[PDB]
Amino acid sequence: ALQTIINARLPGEEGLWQIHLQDGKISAIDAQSGVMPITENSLDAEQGLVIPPFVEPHIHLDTTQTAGQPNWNQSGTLFEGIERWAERKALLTHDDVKQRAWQTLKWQIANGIQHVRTHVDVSDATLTALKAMLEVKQEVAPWIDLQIVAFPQEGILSYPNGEALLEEALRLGADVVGAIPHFEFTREYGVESLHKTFALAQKYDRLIDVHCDEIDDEQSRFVETVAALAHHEGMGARVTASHTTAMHSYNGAYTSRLFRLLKMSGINFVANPLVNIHLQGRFDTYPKRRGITRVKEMLESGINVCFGHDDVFDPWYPLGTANMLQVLHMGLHVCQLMGYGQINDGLNLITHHSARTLNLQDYGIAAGNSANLIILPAENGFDALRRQVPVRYSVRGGKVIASTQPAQTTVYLEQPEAIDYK
Amino acid sequence: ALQTIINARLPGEEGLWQIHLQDGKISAIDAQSGVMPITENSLDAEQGLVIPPFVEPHIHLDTTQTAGQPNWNQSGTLFEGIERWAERKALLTHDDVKQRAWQTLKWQIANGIQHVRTHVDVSDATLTALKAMLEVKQEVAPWIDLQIVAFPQEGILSYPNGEALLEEALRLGADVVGAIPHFEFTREYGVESLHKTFALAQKYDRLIDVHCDEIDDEQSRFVETVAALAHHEGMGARVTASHTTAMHSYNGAYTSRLFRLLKMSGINFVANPLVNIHLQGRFDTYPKRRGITRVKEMLESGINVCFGHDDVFDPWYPLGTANMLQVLHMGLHVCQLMGYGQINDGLNLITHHSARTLNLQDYGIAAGNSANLIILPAENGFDALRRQVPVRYSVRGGKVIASTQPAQTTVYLEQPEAIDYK
Ligand SMILES: C[C@H](O)COCC(COC[C@@H](C)O)(COC[C@@H](C)O)COC[C@@H](C)O
Ligand SMILES: C[C@H](O)COCC(COC[C@@H](C)O)(COC[C@@H](C)O)COC[C@@H](C)O
Ligand SMILES: N[P@]1(=O)C=CNC(=O)N1
Ligand SMILES: N[P@]1(=O)C=CNC(=O)N1
Ligand SMILES: [Zn+2]
Ligand SMILES: [Zn+2]
Ligand SMILES: [Zn+2]
Ligand SMILES: [Zn+2]
């Protein structure tokens, strides 16, 4: 029964802090006069940084851990990835999906992630993975709040009974409506698919998260429809456009015009740096574009943007340990957000901005909130990112649900010396 | 007195292996029939991967740890970096250089790096850093074999007494002659500077490592002169072209013509992914080029290419823990070397290929070689790279010089569970 977290640093605050817990909530946050001694019912943050939990705003738990089954994505493209997945989707079972999803979820718990939005492919007359994931959501609830997106991987209009399958997924309980307009057979299907998506979200009162313009095509502008529909319906906060990698290739004048709408609409954006750097630029020879959306410009304009991992060992990404600091590291480099302050503030892109994207209400280190928080063995955001630190403790509802004993490195010179990389 | 390494995996080999040590050398390597029990005078590799030590073919130890002093590189460009460094170079002292260099060298020892090539700026009438680094080379020799490049940061022809200073650095003992032709005032100075560099290397019998075409300028083609001069003198193995980021922007026909010469010349290439992704593409708006040299194509052509870290917390790079697996991770992503086999073989880009670049003779796990080797807590190269593992043990001359006790992660679900991310 934890009553207190002691010796904690807080981003943008001086000195150490004590965090009081009561009935699974944060009751008070008080400055310390100095380093406090450990007491019973206290958790020692050891002068580490305390932040709300990491968020994964974009992952595919139904595809996770399937890379190479039955074939590998040779070209490393989005489009071959979808073909490889279709082969694997034909082999899906209820137990297979739950086993793989739980494998990745456990890594996420270990990595201080307590909020996860997973897309699940509902281009499947059996809805096997969707129904299994609805179960996983209930099973993992003590540790992770899981959102499920009904994601029509093969299109709403371009796949047999796609719209009916999408609606059935919502009826069954999916939290978010997805779409994939750039993968529809025609631009017209793409636009119409978004109208159907927004109509479904309003009918069932659900969130929207579109795989939007994930393609190096300067003519792929489905994002303007997503934002306009959100604005018309006054539902900006409930709407996310994921990827928008085509925006990397837009001319500047169109982008400037578009940004007015993006700001007015209030929609959210997700960039997925690990996967984007791998899948984008694949049709260039040299020079090769980076292919990540306009993260720097969005931040400058006060548009909410955040980072997801997207894929863990699957047809679209052969790596991953589901680590958000690793995602952030890649994102800061590729987006050239490399000023000291930008790097230090980077934690926001995998915490607060992502919580906003998921429309979370109970999130942040503040009195009255659930005691959901993590402790990093680092002095600040810059230090955590630079040293790629693990999560020392993850606390949920005032209980410890994960812990890492950090590695210990020693060099043997004229005498043994501990190395902290500081 | 270690006599044996037991329970070791070797890249591309089946089962476990025993490595016998004698007089600081590898005496024999024998297959094991099974897991062996720990014995006195034995080091247990614990079924980890054993490889020769990591190599850092390109770092700046004279600039390391100076980021923000006295000013920050605001634009994140090569050119502003040089201006910021010039301000800091004016404040250099003998003790300052040795203290900062040793700080980074210790991180490198901790990271299993036993071979390091450092560039040192010799555009300095006092040669302060160069002379200090010659001392550091002797001091660190029990742990790292350090090569020093006399690097004329501000040009050979474009800096007062540049050529005389470069020659004095060689007379004093620098192992390698540097140059920076794309930073010289004119293309003609650039070409002439390479002639002077090669003349000096032949006069003193030294290696050559040129900062070559580190610029997003499709007309920057100094690499062809470096290769042609190497070919003419028959000295390919002794010559390295670092960066060659302009090659990212060459047309394909010129590149094809050039590659014939690059192969015939036998020169080495260094790409520096962490720094290249940060400094290159800075003059693009959108789309933005990646800016790394043609690593994939070089590998396909049998041209020796490897990865360096380049900078650790300095005017050109505000991050770093001097970790080669992190460099490799960035390189595989940006160069799109993301096939399973390519990732698994990635260790070569920070071991064997780099040893060739430094012209090393005593390197590799083979009988007769010095017992210089490291142990990774991983099953193979792919696993090591994916999980970004630390170095479990670093062995040099048959003695342990560094060790890391790996982190331990536990999640508390219905019962405590250990997480290995596998
Ligand atoms: C390691 C991992 O991949 C498997 O864990 C088993 C697990 C068992 O589910 C129990 C459920 C809540 O009723 C989840 O992890 C353990 C609990 C305590 O969190 C999921 O197994 C899926 C099968 C049964 O298809
Ligand atoms: C932590 C680091 O930044 C400082 O270490 C001190 C160190 C002392 O050098 C001793 C020499 C071999 O004669 C090197 O590390 C310890 C030895 C045992 O390896 C270098 O200090 C530089 C000063 C003296 O300008
Ligand atoms: N890269 P990603 O987000 C993963 C799966 N399917 C997609 O269409 N895109
Ligand atoms: N990026 P880099 O290799 C580091 C220092 N000075 C340079 O000119 N280039
Ligand atoms: Zn079931
Ligand atoms: Zn996705
Ligand atoms: Zn001295
Ligand atoms: Zn350099």
Coordinates of C-alpha atoms in Angstrom, one line a residue, chain A residues 72 76 102-103 106-111 143 247-251 273-282 285-297 313 317-321 323 326 329-330 332-340 343 382 385-388 390-391 400-414 417 419-422, chain B residues 72 76 102-103 106-111 143 247-251 273-282 285-297 313 317-321 323 326 329-330 332-340 343 382 385-388 390-391 400-414 417 419-422:
Chain A
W72 CA 9.0 -11.7 -46.0
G76 CA 10.2 -3.0 -47.8
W102 CA -0.3 -10.3 -25.4
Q103 CA 3.4 -10.9 -26.2
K106 CA 3.8 -7.4 -22.0
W107 CA 6.7 -5.6 -23.5
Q108 CA 4.6 -2.4 -23.5
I109 CA 3.8 -2.8 -19.8
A110 CA 7.5 -3.3 -19.1
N111 CA 8.2 -0.1 -21.0
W143 CA -2.5 -2.7 -16.7
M247 CA 2.5 16.0 -46.7
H248 CA 6.3 15.5 -46.7
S249 CA 6.0 15.9 -50.5
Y250 CA 3.4 18.7 -50.8
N251 CA 4.3 22.1 -52.3
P273 CA 9.2 7.6 -37.4
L274 CA 10.6 4.1 -37.2
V275 CA 8.2 2.7 -39.8
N276 CA 8.0 5.9 -41.9
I277 CA 11.8 6.1 -42.4
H278 CA 11.7 2.4 -43.5
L279 CA 8.7 2.4 -45.9
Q280 CA 8.9 5.9 -47.3
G281 CA 11.3 7.0 -50.0
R282 CA 11.3 3.5 -51.5
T285 CA 16.6 6.4 -56.3
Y286 CA 18.8 9.3 -55.2
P287 CA 18.3 11.7 -53.5
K288 CA 15.8 9.9 -51.3
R289 CA 13.1 11.7 -49.3
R290 CA 12.7 11.1 -45.5
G291 CA 9.0 10.8 -45.8
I292 CA 7.8 11.9 -42.3
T293 CA 5.0 14.4 -42.0
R294 CA 5.6 18.0 -41.2
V295 CA 6.0 17.5 -37.5
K296 CA 8.3 20.6 -36.9
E297 CA 5.8 22.9 -38.7
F313 CA 8.2 -7.4 -35.9
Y317 CA 8.7 -3.5 -39.7
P318 CA 11.2 -6.3 -38.9
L319 CA 12.4 -4.8 -35.6
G320 CA 11.1 -3.2 -32.3
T321 CA 10.9 -3.7 -28.6
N323 CA 10.0 1.3 -26.8
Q326 CA 13.5 4.7 -29.2
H329 CA 15.0 9.3 -30.8
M330 CA 14.3 8.4 -34.4
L332 CA 13.9 13.9 -33.4
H333 CA 16.7 12.9 -35.8
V334 CA 14.6 12.5 -39.0
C335 CA 12.5 15.6 -38.3
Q336 CA 15.6 17.5 -37.3
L337 CA 14.1 18.6 -33.9
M338 CA 17.6 18.7 -32.5
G339 CA 17.8 21.9 -30.5
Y340 CA 18.5 21.3 -26.8
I343 CA 15.0 17.3 -27.4
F382 CA 17.1 15.3 -22.6
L385 CA 16.3 10.5 -24.4
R386 CA 20.1 10.7 -24.8
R387 CA 20.8 7.7 -22.6
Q388 CA 17.7 5.7 -23.8
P390 CA 14.5 2.1 -19.1
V391 CA 11.5 2.7 -16.9
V400 CA 3.7 -0.9 -8.9
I401 CA 3.1 -2.9 -12.1
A402 CA 6.6 -2.9 -13.6
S403 CA 10.2 -2.3 -12.5
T404 CA 13.6 -2.4 -14.1
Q405 CA 16.9 -2.7 -12.2
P406 CA 19.1 -0.6 -14.4
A407 CA 22.2 -2.1 -16.0
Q408 CA 25.5 -1.6 -14.2
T409 CA 28.7 -0.9 -16.2
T410 CA 32.3 -0.9 -14.9
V411 CA 35.6 -0.4 -16.7
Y412 CA 38.8 -1.8 -15.2
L413 CA 41.5 0.8 -15.7
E414 CA 44.1 1.5 -13.1
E417 CA 35.3 2.7 -12.3
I419 CA 30.3 4.3 -15.9
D420 CA 27.1 6.3 -16.0
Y421 CA 27.5 8.0 -19.4
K422 CA 27.1 11.4 -17.8
Chain B
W72 CA 24.9 26.6 -29.6
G76 CA 22.1 22.5 -37.1
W102 CA 39.2 10.9 -21.7
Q103 CA 35.6 11.3 -20.7
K106 CA 35.9 5.9 -21.0
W107 CA 32.4 5.6 -22.5
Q108 CA 34.0 3.9 -25.5
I109 CA 35.8 1.4 -23.4
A110 CA 32.6 0.6 -21.6
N111 CA 31.0 0.1 -25.0
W143 CA 42.6 -0.2 -23.5
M247 CA 27.1 11.1 -53.4
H248 CA 23.5 11.0 -52.1
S249 CA 22.7 13.7 -54.6
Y250 CA 24.7 12.6 -57.7
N251 CA 22.9 11.6 -60.9
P273 CA 24.4 8.1 -39.9
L274 CA 23.7 9.9 -36.6
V275 CA 25.4 13.1 -37.7
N276 CA 24.5 12.8 -41.4
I277 CA 20.8 12.6 -40.8
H278 CA 21.0 15.7 -38.6
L279 CA 23.3 17.9 -40.7
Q280 CA 22.2 16.9 -44.2
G281 CA 19.0 18.0 -45.9
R282 CA 19.1 21.3 -43.9
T285 CA 12.4 22.5 -47.5
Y286 CA 10.1 19.6 -48.4
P287 CA 10.7 17.0 -49.5
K288 CA 14.0 16.6 -47.6
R289 CA 16.8 14.3 -48.6
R290 CA 18.3 11.8 -46.2
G291 CA 21.8 12.7 -47.1
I292 CA 23.8 9.5 -46.3
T293 CA 26.2 8.2 -48.9
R294 CA 25.4 5.2 -51.1
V295 CA 26.0 2.5 -48.5
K296 CA 23.7 -0.1 -50.0
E297 CA 25.2 0.2 -53.5
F313 CA 27.9 16.2 -27.6
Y317 CA 25.7 16.7 -32.6
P318 CA 24.0 17.4 -29.3
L319 CA 23.6 13.7 -28.3
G320 CA 25.5 10.5 -28.0
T321 CA 26.8 7.9 -25.6
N323 CA 27.5 3.5 -28.8
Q326 CA 23.0 2.8 -31.9
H329 CA 20.5 1.1 -35.9
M330 CA 20.3 4.6 -37.4
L332 CA 20.2 0.5 -41.2
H333 CA 17.0 2.6 -41.1
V334 CA 18.2 5.6 -43.1
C335 CA 20.0 3.4 -45.7
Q336 CA 17.0 1.0 -45.8
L337 CA 19.2 -2.0 -45.1
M338 CA 16.2 -3.6 -43.4
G339 CA 16.2 -7.2 -44.8
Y340 CA 16.6 -9.8 -42.0
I343 CA 20.3 -6.5 -40.3
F382 CA 19.9 -9.3 -35.4
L385 CA 20.8 -4.8 -32.9
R386 CA 17.1 -5.2 -32.2
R387 CA 17.4 -5.1 -28.4
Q388 CA 20.3 -2.6 -28.4
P390 CA 25.1 -3.6 -23.9
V391 CA 28.5 -5.3 -23.9
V400 CA 38.7 -8.2 -18.8
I401 CA 38.7 -4.5 -19.2
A402 CA 34.9 -3.8 -19.0
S403 CA 31.7 -5.5 -17.9
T404 CA 28.0 -4.7 -17.8
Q405 CA 25.5 -6.4 -15.6
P406 CA 22.4 -6.2 -17.8
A407 CA 19.2 -4.5 -16.7
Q408 CA 16.5 -6.7 -15.2
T409 CA 12.9 -6.0 -16.0
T410 CA 9.9 -7.5 -14.2
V411 CA 6.2 -6.9 -14.8
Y412 CA 3.7 -7.6 -11.9
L413 CA 0.6 -9.2 -13.5
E414 CA -1.2 -12.0 -11.8
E417 CA 7.1 -12.1 -14.8
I419 CA 10.7 -9.6 -19.5
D420 CA 13.5 -10.3 -21.9
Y421 CA 11.9 -8.8 -25.0
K422 CA 12.3 -12.1 -26.9

